[PDB]
UniProtKB/Swiss-Prot annotation, chain A:
SUPFAM superfamilies: dsRNA-binding domain-like, Ribosomal protein S5 domain 2-like
GO molecular function: rRNA binding; structural constituent of ribosome
Family per similarity comment: Belongs to the universal ribosomal protein uS5 family.
Name of the protein this chain belongs to: Small ribosomal subunit protein uS5
Any one GO cellular component localisation term in the record: cytosolic small ribosomal subunit
PANTHER family from the UniProt entry: 40S RIBOSOMAL PROTEIN S2, RIBOSOMAL S SUBUNIT
Source domain of life: Archaea
Gene, per the UniProt record: rps5
Protein function: With S4 and S12 plays an important role in translational accuracy.
Organism: Pyrococcus abyssi (strain GE5 / Orsay)
UniProtKB/Swiss-Prot annotation, chain B:
Annotated organism of origin: Pyrococcus abyssi (strain GE5 / Orsay)
Keywords: Ribonucleoprotein, Ribosomal protein, RNA-binding, rRNA-binding
Gene: rps8
Protein name: Small ribosomal subunit protein uS8
GO CC list: ribonucleoprotein complex; ribosome
PROSITE patterns for the chain: RIBOSOMAL_S8
Transmembrane segments: none
Gene Ontology biological-process annotations: translation
GO MF annotation list: rRNA binding; structural constituent of ribosome
Quaternary structure note: Part of the 30S ribosomal subunit.
Keyword Membrane: no
Swiss-Prot record, chain E:
Transmembrane segments: none
Native source organism of the sequence: Pyrococcus abyssi (strain GE5 / Orsay)
Protein family membership: Belongs to the universal ribosomal protein uS4 family.
Subunit structure: Part of the 30S ribosomal subunit. Contacts protein S5. The interaction surface between S4 and S5 is involved in control of translational fidelity.
Known role: One of the primary rRNA binding proteins, it binds directly to 16S rRNA where it nucleates assembly of the body of the 30S subunit.
Source taxon at top rank: Archaea
Residue numbers of the full-length protein present here: 2 to 90 of 180
Protein name: Small ribosomal subunit protein uS4
UniProtKB/Swiss-Prot annotation, chain G:
GO cellular component terms, A-Z: small ribosomal subunit
Keyword list, A-Z: Ribonucleoprotein, Ribosomal protein
Protein name: Small ribosomal subunit protein uS2
Organism field: Pyrococcus abyssi (strain GE5 / Orsay)
Cited Gene3D superfamilies: Glucose-6-phosphate isomerase like protein, domain 1 (3.40.50.10490)
Keyword Ribonucleoprotein belongs to the record: yes
Length: 229, 129, 151, 48, 89, 61, 196, 57
RNA sequence: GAGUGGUGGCCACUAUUAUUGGGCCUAAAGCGGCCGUAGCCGGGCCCGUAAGUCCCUGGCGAAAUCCCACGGCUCAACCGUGGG
RNA sequence: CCCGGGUAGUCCUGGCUGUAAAGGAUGCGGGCUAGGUGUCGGGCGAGCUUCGAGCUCGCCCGGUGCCGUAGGGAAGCCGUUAA
């Protein structure tokens, strides 16, 4: 954590913002990661997240989900292209998913990491299982669903200490968001990694779409964004 | 033909709240629909409602507040004993106390929390959350 | 929808909700029953009598007066005719369908190759059988009564 | 195609009949119940 | 039917070759000097049984459930796994 | 609103041109409406609203 | 009473709609003539013009953007930008002006004014993506989808567009205090419109 | 302490992290803040100021 | 790891049998069309009944086998006393 | 395959046969969920008229087409005539 403070300070001085939100963040009018959501802004500069959430650059907070190479046909042979699917997060309350393309693997990886920061979202965590009523943010607070292509995903709250009962792609995505225990059910073709990952991402995003009362926040221990002990 | 007035009412409500309607008219009214509306209002899922008389079965006018995730009828009307509510909750609801099941008992129509408190069973007829 | 054609016409009467007869109506119950008996003795059908009462005498349906003898129920044309013994022996709609079917059976004797008019005969007889089943169940017809076209 | 049928409370007999009828389209079930492998196996069901 | 057959008291992994699980188990085996994997697996099963009993009793009510709840707590803190003021959670 | 149905027809109080009689008639008749005293025609039926040949005095509620 | 006499409103043709209508514009429609043409109410236009004048005067002057693809609307928006200090883009709107930071004329406003939602569909589509309020002039034919403040008027005529922008500019100037009275504003209406 | 999530003026539902919502001061009075969610903007739902009562897009 | 491999069977994998919980325009799959008997599904209100349904309580559904605590074989496997 | 001829058949009366890419490749009844714009039948209102069972505009119900919002879908696409 100490290193990332000075890293964020270093990036902040040598950055020339190009957009309105970048100008606000450079001037110090916006100081916390939570202040850029829920008001319709556009996010086009990756330095915003570097300044506000410096720990998305740690090696342990990034994941290369998949690498594929695809072919376009021409009269002079086959032209090869790389597609990389990647994700980042802070292991507390924020997560992003991105795809990058390039002529070689390194360029594709760099672009995929770059686009994942621009697609960042914040989620809600809690405890809603019938056999664990502990009010601590270790799972999803209620059953949620998401879909992409032919893939359907349903996430179900689980007891503390159970683990992530889901395929590996879901394991990595849910781990980067700060979730420890969950049950799941799926339909469709999960071997298509892109659609699987996007479906889990949509299911996580849909925790913000469920109406809740002030009693429920107390009951399920619902936390938005950073846990903040 | 028309087979079930209560299912029509609940599907109409859940269709209307997804496009942001502020009021609805339930066209065939009945006493059972009135009971379900009373139980829903007690828990804050709807606003005020009223009965309008034509020469026919009558109409209900209901105010919506944008507080319903989903509402539906249960068919068939399964009998349930006084200590078996958990599995129906897992079948229909999203978390351990999220929303209500609406139960018809020989002491009236009530939510499954009140029925569990009194220690009696009955028939499942609807769910709202 | 329609029973056989599955069309969805919606035209019909739109009756306002009222309990008491209107103020401007001046006839009493005795006058109305006299009028109904007189029109019946002129030979009109039950549906026609109400049409004439509405059109010419300004009387919206007789189902606005309480039965003088039985307070539990309102007054209808068939009840008024029953009180005097002029009520039909066979229910009217069944009689009308039977009459329509007999006329069509003599058309089909001279035109045996008219196959499209024959399906209409089959549909009419299906309606007749549904009606006779309903009336047998309620006791408006004897247990032995049967529809035989050769009769 | 409309709603799956029958869903009625007092329609158990037809539902059980429907499931029994369409189970014979399953090739694994049919071969075990009619014992089709046993009738043609030169090893007569032995492992060696 | 069939008479009783005695069953194993431990459970085996669902997949034998998973890299992360192998690393974790190797760390434990080397630190505590166990003879073979099944020994380790034995202890794992014990833990899971305790957990499975706690999950079932949080969701139960009645007279027998309370007896079993206090019995579980007493057995756990007799073995030295819990402090004397611990709760079911 | 239009939840309750309301008819588009009306009852009318008219005056016979010949006899001078006053009657109440329906605006959408299905038969020929004639005077109750003398027998002259008062309203003729059509596809929709009828054709009134008498003097209109009042539109009843 | 009114910003201008109703004779002026009618002489410019502000109340003239088109042959078509929409369900959501019916609160503004006054009546329909015998030849199938809809007419707009003039009092609603005046009231909305006053409100819009109050609303736009609170923004920083150089952060307002006004666009017009239609040929008859290019001169009035240019004059409007000249008077009030706002940026004006007449003619073709280059895609990516508000979404592509690499473009030379990249510019993010605080509020946009649309002359015609149907013709200016690129600008509206890009404005929806950056989350700013949208002020538009709507005819009997338009939809109110994604419009936050609507001003009902004929948005196809020449004199009509000229008059609307003249009044709006005067209202902004008066509300923000650059003239002490409405009358001090001595710039003819003819200066706002396209000639020939 | 925590932070509060904004709520739509017309429908009362919360604003999701990446939706095309908008907010602005009241045109007529300028003393209150109007929030509009994406669904209300798409469907042209009316809104009403809590201070002056002026209404509608 | 005193075990570790080969062949055959059943369950899982499989929402490839689907009550929970699947499909039928173009991929397997809507009878060429319609009428109708049993069966299944059936509009609103009032009164009665108490068959289904729900609650309370008597008599039963052997022992072994299953789960929990405590006690006896060094601990355990096993065996005993109690509660389910 | 192209050209000149040609029997059965194609047509009528009384029977049998029961088959098609018999395709809307979409079983039937009921409730509900933005709009816009053509056309056919009936009804209501207003304005014209050479007085025509005529013409133009608007609204309600029922048929028949196209473009499309939410939603659905592997996509093509469907979208109050729902998939
Ligand atoms: Mg070439
Ligand atoms: Mg899709
Ligand atoms: Mg045996
Ligand atoms: Mg297999
Ligand atoms: Mg399948
Ligand atoms: Mg067919
Ligand atoms: Mg077919
Ligand atoms: Mg049939
Ligand atoms: Mg009923
Ligand atoms: Mg009983
Ligand atoms: Mg026993
Ligand atoms: Mg010992
Ligand atoms: Mg022991
Ligand atoms: Mg023993
Ligand atoms: Mg030839
Ligand atoms: Mg054909
Ligand atoms: Mg017409
Ligand atoms: Mg139509
Ligand atoms: Mg379409
Ligand atoms: Zn928990
Ligand atoms: Zn007369
Ligand atoms: Zn809203
Ligand atoms: Zn205000």
């Amino acid at each position: 954590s100490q290193e990332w403070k000075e890293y964020a300070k270093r990036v902040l001085d040598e950055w020339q913002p190009k957009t309105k939100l970048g100008m606000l963040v450079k001037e110090g009018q916006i100081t916390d990661i939570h202040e850029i959501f829920r008001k319709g802004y556009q996010i086009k500069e990756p330095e915003i997240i570097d300044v506000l959430l410096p720990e998305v650059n740690a090696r342990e907070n990034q994941e290369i989900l998949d690498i594929a190479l695809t072919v376009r046909m021409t009269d002079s042979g086959r032209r090869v292209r790389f597609r990389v699917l990647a994700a980042v997060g802070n292991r507390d309350g924020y997560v992003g998913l991105g795809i990058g393309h390039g002529r070689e693997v390194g360029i594709a990886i760099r672009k995929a990491i770059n686009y994942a920061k621009l697609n960042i979202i914040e989620i809600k965590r809690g405890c809603g299982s019938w056999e664990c009523r502990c009010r601590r943010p270790h799972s999803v607070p209620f059953t949620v669903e998401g879909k992409e292509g032919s893939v359907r995903v349903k996430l179900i709250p689980g007891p503390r200490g159970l683990g992530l009962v889901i395929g590996d792609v879901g394991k990595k995505i849910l781990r980067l968001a700060g979730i420890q225990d969950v049950w799941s059910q799926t339909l469709g073709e999960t071997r298509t990694t892109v659609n699987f990952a996007k479906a889990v991402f949509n299911a996580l995003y849909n925790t913000n779409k469920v109406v809740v009362t002030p009693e429920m926040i107390e009951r399920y221990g619902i936390v938005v964004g950073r846990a903040m002990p | 033909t028309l087979l079930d007035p209560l299912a029509n009412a609940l599907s109409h409500i859940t269709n209307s709240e997804r496009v942001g309607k502020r009021e609805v008219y339930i066209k065939p009214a009945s006493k059972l629909i009135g009971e379900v509306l009373r139980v829903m209002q007690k828990y804050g899922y709807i606003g005020e409602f009223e009965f309008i008389d034509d020469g026919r079965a009558g109409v209900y006018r209901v105010q919506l507040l944008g507080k319903i995730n989903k509402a539906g009828a249960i068919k068939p009307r399964f009998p349930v004993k006084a200590r078996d509510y958990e599995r129906w909750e897992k079948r229909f609801l999203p978390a351990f106390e999220f929303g209500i099941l609406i139960v018809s008992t020989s002491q009236g129509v009530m939510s499954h929390k009140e029925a569990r408190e009194k220690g009696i069973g009955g028939r499942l007829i609807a769910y709202v959350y | 929808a329609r029973m056989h054609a599955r069309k969805r016409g919606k035209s019909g009467s739109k009756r306002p909700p009222r309990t008491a007869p209107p103020i401007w109506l001046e006839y009493t119950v005795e006058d109305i029953e006299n009028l109904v008996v007189k029109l019946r003795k002129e030979g009109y059908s039950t549906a026609m009598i109400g049409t004439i009462l509405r059109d010419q005498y300004g009387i919206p349906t007789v189902k606005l007066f309480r039965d003088p003898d039985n307070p539990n129920r309102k007054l209808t044309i068939t009840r008024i005719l029953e009180k005097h013994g002029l009520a039909p022996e066979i229910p009217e709609d069944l009689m009308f369908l039977i009459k329509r079917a007999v006329n069509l059976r003599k058309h089909l004797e001279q035109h045996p190759k008219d196959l499209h008019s024959m399906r209409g005969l089959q549909l009419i007889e299906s309606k007749i059988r549904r009606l006779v089943k309903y009336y047998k169940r309620k006791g408006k017809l004897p247990k032995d009564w049967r529809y035989d076209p050769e009769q | 195609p409309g709603k799956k049928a029958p869903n009625g409370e007092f329609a158990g007999r037809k539902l059980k009949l429907k499931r029994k009828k369409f189970r014979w389209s399953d090739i694994r079930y049919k071969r075990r119940v009619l014992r089709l492998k046993e009738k043609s196996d030169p090893l007569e069901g032995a492992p060696q | 039917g069939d008479p009783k057959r005695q069953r194993k008291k431990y459970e085996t992994p669902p997949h034998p070759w998973i890299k992360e699980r192998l690393d974790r188990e190797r760390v434990l085996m080397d630190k505590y000097e166990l003879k073979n994997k099944k020994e380790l697996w034995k202890h794992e099963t014990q833990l899971k049984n305790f957990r499975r009993r706690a999950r079932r009793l949080l969701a139960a009510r009645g007279k027998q459930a309370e007896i079993e709840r206090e019995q579980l707590l007493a057995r756990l803190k007799r073995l030295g796994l819990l402090p004397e003021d611990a709760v079911l959670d | 609103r239009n939840v309750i149905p309301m008819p588009r027809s009306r009852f009318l109080r008219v005056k016979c041109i010949d006899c001078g009689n006053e009657q109440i008639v329906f605006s959408h008749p299905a038969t020929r409406v004639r005077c109750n005293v003398c027998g002259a025609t008062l309203v003729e039926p059509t596809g929709g609203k009828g054709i009134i040949r008498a003097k209109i005095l009042e539109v009843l509620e | 009473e009114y910003l201008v006499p109703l004779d002026q409103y009618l002489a410019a043709g502000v109340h003239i709609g088109t042959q078509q209508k929409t369900k959501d514009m019916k609160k503004f429609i006054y009546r329909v003539r015998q030849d199938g043409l809809y007419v707009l109410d003039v009092r609603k236009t005046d009231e909305r013009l006053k409100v819009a004048g109050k609303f736009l005067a609170r923004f920083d002057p150089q952060s307002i953007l006004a666009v017009s693809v239609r040929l008859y609307g290019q001169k009035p928006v240019k004059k409007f930008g000249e008077v009030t200090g706002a940026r004006a883009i007449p003619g073709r709107f280059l895609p990516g002006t508000m979404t592509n930071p690499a473009v030379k004329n990249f510019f993010e406003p605080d509020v946009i004014i649309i002359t015609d939602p149907r013709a200016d569909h690129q600008a509206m589509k890009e404005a929806i993506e950056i989350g700013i309020p949208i002020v538009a002039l709507v005819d009997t034919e338009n939809l109110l989808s994604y419009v936050d403040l609507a001003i009902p008027t004929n948005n196809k005529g020449r004199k009509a567009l000229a008059l609307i922008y003249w009044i709006l500019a005067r209202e902004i100037l008066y509300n923000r205090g650059e003239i002490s009275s409405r009358e001090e504003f001595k710039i003819p209406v003819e200066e706002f419109e396209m000639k020939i | 302490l925590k932070f509060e999530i904004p709520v739509c003026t017309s429908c009362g539902r919360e604003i999701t992290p990446r939706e095309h919502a908008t907010h602005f001061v009241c045109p007529n009075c300028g003393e209150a803040i109007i929030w509009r969610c994406e669904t209300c903007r798409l469907l042209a739902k009316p809104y009403k100021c809590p201070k002056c009562g002026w209404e509608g897009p």
